[PDB]
Amino acid sequence: SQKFDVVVIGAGPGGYVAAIRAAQLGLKTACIEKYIGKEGKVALGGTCLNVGCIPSKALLDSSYKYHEAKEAFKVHGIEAKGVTIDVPAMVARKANIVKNLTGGIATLFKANGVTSFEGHGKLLANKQVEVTGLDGKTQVLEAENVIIASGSRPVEIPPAPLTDDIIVDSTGALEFQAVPKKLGVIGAGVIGLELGSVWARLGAEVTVLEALDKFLPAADEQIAKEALKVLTKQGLNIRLGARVTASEVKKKQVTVTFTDANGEQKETFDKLIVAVGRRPVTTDLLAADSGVTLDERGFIYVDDHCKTSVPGVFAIGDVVRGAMLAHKASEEGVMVAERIAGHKAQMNYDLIPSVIYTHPEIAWVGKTEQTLKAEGVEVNVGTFPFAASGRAMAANDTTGLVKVIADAKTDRVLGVHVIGPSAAELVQQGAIGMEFGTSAEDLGMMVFSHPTLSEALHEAALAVNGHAIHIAN
Amino acid sequence: QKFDVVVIGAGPGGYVAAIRAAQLGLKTACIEKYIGKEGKVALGGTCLNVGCIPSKALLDSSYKYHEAKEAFKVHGIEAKGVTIDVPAMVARKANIVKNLTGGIATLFKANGVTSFEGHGKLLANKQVEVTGLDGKTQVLEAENVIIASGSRPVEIPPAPLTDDIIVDSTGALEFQAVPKKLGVIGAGVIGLELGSVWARLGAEVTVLEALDKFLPAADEQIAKEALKVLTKQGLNIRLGARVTASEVKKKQVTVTFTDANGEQKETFDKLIVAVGRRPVTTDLLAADSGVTLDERGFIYVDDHCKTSVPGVFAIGDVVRGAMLAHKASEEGVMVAERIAGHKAQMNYDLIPSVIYTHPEIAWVGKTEQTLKAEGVEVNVGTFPFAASGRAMAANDTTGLVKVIADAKTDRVLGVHVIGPSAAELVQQGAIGMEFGTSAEDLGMMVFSHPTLSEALHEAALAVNGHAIHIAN
Ligand SMILES: Cc1cc2nc3c(=O)[nH]c(=O)nc-3n(C[C@H](O)[C@H](O)[C@H](O)COP(=O)(O)OP(=O)(O)OC[C@H]3O[C@@H](n4cnc5c(N)ncnc54)[C@H](O)[C@@H]3O)c2cc1C
Ligand SMILES: Cc1cc2nc3c(=O)[nH]c(=O)nc-3n(C[C@H](O)[C@H](O)[C@H](O)COP(=O)(O)OP(=O)(O)OC[C@H]3O[C@@H](n4cnc5c(N)ncnc54)[C@H](O)[C@@H]3O)c2cc1C
Numbered sequence: 001s002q003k004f005d006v007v008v009i010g011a012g013p014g015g016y017v018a019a020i021r022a023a024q025l026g027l028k029t030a031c032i033e034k035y036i037g038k039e040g041k042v043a044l045g046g047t048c049l050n051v052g053c054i055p056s057k058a059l060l061d062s063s064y065k066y067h068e069a070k071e072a073f074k075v076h077g078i079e080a081k082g083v084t085i086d087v088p089a090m091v092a093r094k095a096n097i098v099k100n101l102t103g104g105i106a107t108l109f110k111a112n113g114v115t116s117f118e119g120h121g122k123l124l125a126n127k128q129v130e131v132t133g134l135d136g137k138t139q140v141l142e143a144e145n146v147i148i149a150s151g152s153r154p155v156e157i158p159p160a161p162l163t164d165d166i167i168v169d170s171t172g173a174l175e176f177q178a179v180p181k182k183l184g185v186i187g188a189g190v191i192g193l194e195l196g197s198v199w200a201r202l203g204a205e206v207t208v209l210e211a212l213d214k215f216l217p218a219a220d221e222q223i224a225k226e227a228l229k230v231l232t233k234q235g236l237n238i239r240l241g242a243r244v245t246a247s248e249v250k251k252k253q254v255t256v257t258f259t260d261a262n263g264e265q266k267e268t269f270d271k272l273i274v275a276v277g278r279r280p281v282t283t284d285l286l287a288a289d290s291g292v293t294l295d296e297r298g299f300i301y302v303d304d305h306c307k308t309s310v311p312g313v314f315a316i317g318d319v320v321r322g323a324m325l326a327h328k329a330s331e332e333g334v335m336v337a338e339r340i341a342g343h344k345a346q347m348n349y350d351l352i353p354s355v356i357y358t359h360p361e362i363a364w365v366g367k368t369e370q371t372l373k374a375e376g377v378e379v380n381v382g383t384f385p386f387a388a389s390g391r392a393m394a395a396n397d398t399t400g401l402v403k404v405i406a407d408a409k410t411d412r413v414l415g416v417h418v419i420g421p422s423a424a425e426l427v428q429q430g431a432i433g434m435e436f437g438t439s440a441e442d443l444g445m446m447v448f449s450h451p452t453l454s455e456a457l458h459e460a461a462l463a464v465n466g467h468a469i470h471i472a473n
Numbered sequence: 474q475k476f477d478v479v480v481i482g483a484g485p486g487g488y489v490a491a492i493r494a495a496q497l498g499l500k501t502a503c504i505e506k507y508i509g510k511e512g513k514v515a516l517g518g519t520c521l522n523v524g525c526i527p528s529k530a531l532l533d534s535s536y537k538y539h540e541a542k543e544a545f546k547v548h549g550i551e552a553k554g555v556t557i558d559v560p561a562m563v564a565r566k567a568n569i570v571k572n573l574t575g576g577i578a579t580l581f582k583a584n585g586v587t588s589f590e591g592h593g594k595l596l597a598n599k600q601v602e603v604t605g606l607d608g609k610t611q612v613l614e615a616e617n618v619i620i621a622s623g624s625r626p627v628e629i630p631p632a633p634l635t636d637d638i639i640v641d642s643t644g645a646l647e648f649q650a651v652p653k654k655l656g657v658i659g660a661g662v663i664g665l666e667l668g669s670v671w672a673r674l675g676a677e678v679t680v681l682e683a684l685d686k687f688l689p690a691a692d693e694q695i696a697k698e699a700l701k702v703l704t705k706q707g708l709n710i711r712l713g714a715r716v717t718a719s720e721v722k723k724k725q726v727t728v729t730f731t732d733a734n735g736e737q738k739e740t741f742d743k744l745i746v747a748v749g750r751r752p753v754t755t756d757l758l759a760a761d762s763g764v765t766l767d768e769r770g771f772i773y774v775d776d777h778c779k780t781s782v783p784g785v786f787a788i789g790d791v792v793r794g795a796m797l798a799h800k801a802s803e804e805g806v807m808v809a810e811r812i813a814g815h816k817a818q819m820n821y822d823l824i825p826s827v828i829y830t831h832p833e834i835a836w837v838g839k840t841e842q843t844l845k846a847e848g849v850e851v852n853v854g855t856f857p858f859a860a861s862g863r864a865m866a867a868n869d870t871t872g873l874v875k876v877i878a879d880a881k882t883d884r885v886l887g888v889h890v891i892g893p894s895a896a897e898l899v900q901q902g903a904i905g906m907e908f909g910t911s912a913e914d915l916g917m918m919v920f921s922h923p924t925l926s927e928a929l930h931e932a933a934l935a936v937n938g939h940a941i942h943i944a945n
Contacts, residue, residue, distance in 0.1 A: 089549030
């Protein structure tokens with residue numbers, strides 16, 4: 001009853017996928033989770049399902065539909081009088097989606113034979129896992145293998161500590177019951193831009209204070225430049241080189257002090273979202289005699305196969321090195337489970353795509369132009385704008401472009417970058433090609449359906465070598 | 474006077490062939506006769522002027538109206554009243570057409586393509602007679618001719634086009650008001666798309682289809698779901714219903730048709746005839762041109778689109794194969810490259826199909842029923858959008874992805890989708906299939922979460938019984 005082949009600590013994208021895969025492989029598997037959802041019961045799915053990926057995308061989709069009805073219907077002949085959005089109802093839809101999907105994970109666990117434990121797991125020496133239940137009582141599970149998937153939480157900064165319901169992190173930003181009239185966001189990363197977009201669409205006057213001089217430095221510079229222009233026009237007052245140093249709450253508002261190129265500045269908001277990154281969670285996770293070590297940044301140290309310093313103990317997802325993304329965590333979970341089952345399964349960290357769920361959506365896979373320049377790789381670049389896409393014109397959504405980067409000597413595609421409609425789907429097309437070593441000409445030779453947004457990738461690939469049909473080369 | 478390449482027709486086949494030929498350094502002419510809305514010749518063929526683009530424009534506008542009327546409350550979005558201005562909707566479509574047709578002329582100018590306005594006829598010895606709009610003729614001496622004369626709607630005596638009451642797809646894209654009761658003959662792609670436009674805007678739509686089987690070219694599982702969903706959307710699709718006569722009186726039309734229960738009648742305010750497409754060869758070939766037609770009226774060509782006359786090629790809807798814009802354009806590229814000396818080939822096995830209903834329907838490769846008829850043992854994996862977190866956030870969970878793989882080699886043989894972004898997910902499958910992907914190959918790749926693409930990933934994993942997010 002206490003013995004398992006695999007004990008997983010955490011039921012986020014890393015842990016719950018690892019648990020399902022382990023069970024599919026015939027391993028007697030347990031998964032421990034402590035997070036309490038909205039109904040007062042344990043809810044699986046981790047950050048991503050409960051306070052992350054899914055909730056944010058739900059509010060992004062609802063808020064965009066309102067925005068389009070208010071600002072982009074007349075051109076179609078559609079007249080909608082007095083369109084309004086009720087924030088409590090919008091948030092309630094998101095909550096219902098979360099409830100359904102978290103229950104869905106429990107259904108998958110049941111179907112696959114995963115044993116769930118409710119409470120806090122702590123790794124002791126020699127792969128024993130102590131579970132403190134919700135009633136405070138402890139039991140020890142004897143594990144042949146342990147998969148640590150304890151995830152992350154928001155970074156906290158002393159200049160902007162969470163305060164009442166006025167200074168919030170991403171979790172509180174997904175729970176506003178009314179549109180903040182003036183909204184401040186600290187951090188112009190993915191989370192800050194997505195959350196700022198939600199509330200700007202519904203009428204908030206949004207300022208985003210970003211300490212770095214460079215916007216979206218991980219994105220391709222051409223993509224980031226267009227993103228900054230478009231998002232600023234949408235009402236995200238993105239201030240670069242602006243570092244918050246202090247805040248003061250009074251009269252149900254918060255005044256932020258920050259330093260920019262022109263010196264000390266102050267700005268007052270009704271709500272302030274702190275979105276300055278995420279940190280790995282190891283709180284009470286490892287006994288002093290567990291043998292598992294942390295790096296200087298607080299991540300659990302693992303090798304390229306996610307194995308810790310302790311045989312039979314693995315760690316995956318946001319608590320270890322690499323991109324802090326849900327699909328990265330889940331793929332690591334699959335790899336670890338398959339390796340426990342005896343398969344020499346491998347993971348490719350080079351083709352993990354990134355998506356920013358603004359509208360226009362931003363997505364990419366592979367290397368940026370600036371990275372390849374720093375590496376000394378000569379490249380050919382092809383782009384195609386959605387302004388030249390018949391499908392995008394029909395959709396009344398022509399902002400953005402597709403960019404394909406190929407090695408100048410071999411024509412191998414090295415990166416695909418998109419800002420525009422269905423960016424993530426077009427990037428996935430590129431990623432599939434790159435898995436097979438596609439050249440730019442390979443993509444150019446394929447039949448792409450017309451009219452589709454995918455044609456923009458086809459034209460960009462042809463443009464790499466100067467023979468796109470529908471733009472000057 | 475003299476050209477390396479003379480192209481007859483400026484549709485997706487002809488205009489792309491002309492651009493590519495010019496890019497390859499060939500002195501190229503393109504002849505077109507179609508008169509657009511401004512009274513001048515308009516390029517882009519059926520697809521741009523009265524086909525792909527206009528239909529998708531009305532599909533997108535009508536869908537946005539439909540969603541606002543029927544699927545906003547769940548988001549907390551309330552309206553005091555949503556209405557559609559049909560003249561304004563059609564005018565947006567007309568403006569898109571005008572911009573894109575002008576865009577082709579801009580591309581021709583930038584690439585050095587010489588345009589001729591009028592009717593082109595192939596004479597003997599690769600001479601092309603151009604009859605201008607004033608009836609005057611001139612002869613071009615062509616080293617190579619590319620025939621790209623396209624297609625037009627099929628006509629049937631029981632439903633002849635009549636004023637504005639009985640129309641084909643061209644007239645159906647020009648209604649200035651929502652018909653109260655709308656009849657459609659033919660439940661193919663065009664009938665379903667046009668029926669969808671007007672049903673969304675309030676028309677009571679009946680689709681009369683003579684065949685017993687719905688969407689026979691699609692995978693049967695996809696077609697069954699499509700029939701269910703489209704019927705729920707108000708397309709009263711009547712299978713095994715053959716129209717035999719019609720009668721126009723007092724701005725309405727009564728249709729007579731035969732179904733399993735005998736002779737039936739139904740009356741409509743408007744009737745759309747959508748009973749297929751046929752190749753155009755009208756006055757195209759002199760009797761001694763040397764180019765032959767097959768029994769069905771298509772120009773006879775080999776797999777490189779070469780006719781029975783060396784240096785004369787034919788592409789697009791006027792030759793064999795799927796009557797689709799991307800098929801025509803790729804044939805144009807192949808022919809131009811072959812004229813320039815390259816042994817260019819065309820892949821006829823991975824041409825995708827798309828039906829722009831909502832939910833969208835798309836597929837590439839072979840259906841389950843085709844593979845069973847061929848005796849190929851397969852494994853099938855499916856994943857429903859009801860289990861997609863991205864689709865749930867989008868409030869759009871109808872449909873599924875289906876992946877079919879060879880049971881022995883695991884090679885993916887077909888990908889079929891009904892649901893959001895169907896065409897984009899099918900293109901992902903088609904790219905994989907170009908590289909010979911197995912189902913496990915797709916399963917081992919990292920798919921971004923949350924995205925609609927994950928449904929293809931899960932379906933690929935389901936082929937071999939280890940999808941994560943559905944029971945296996
Ligand atoms: C607003 C926001 C939006 C995001 N949007 C996206 C997106 O769109 N796409 C994307 O790829 N990523 C997105 N992310 C990031 C994504 O959420 C993470 O990368 C992902 O959740 C990490 O998965 P994980 O399993 O490693 O960690 P987590 O999801 O954090 O799961 C860790 C689990 O372990 C539990 N736990 C921790 N310690 C213990 C313990 N001792 N005992 C028992 N249980 C424990 C926790 O309660 C939690 O459930 C977003 C993040 C945020 C904050
Ligand atoms: C309502 C409708 C919707 C459609 N939607 C899609 C879709 O979404 N996706 C898709 O792939 N396909 C779609 N199609 C089909 C698509 O339009 C055709 O497959 C495509 O246009 C064929 O390209 P083509 O160049 O061979 O022929 P065409 O587009 O028909 O062009 C032929 C050109 O040649 C001209 N011509 C003919 N004879 C002569 C002559 N002697 N001299 C000079 N000019 C001549 C014609 O005026 C015409 O412009 C649709 C069709 C219809 C009717």
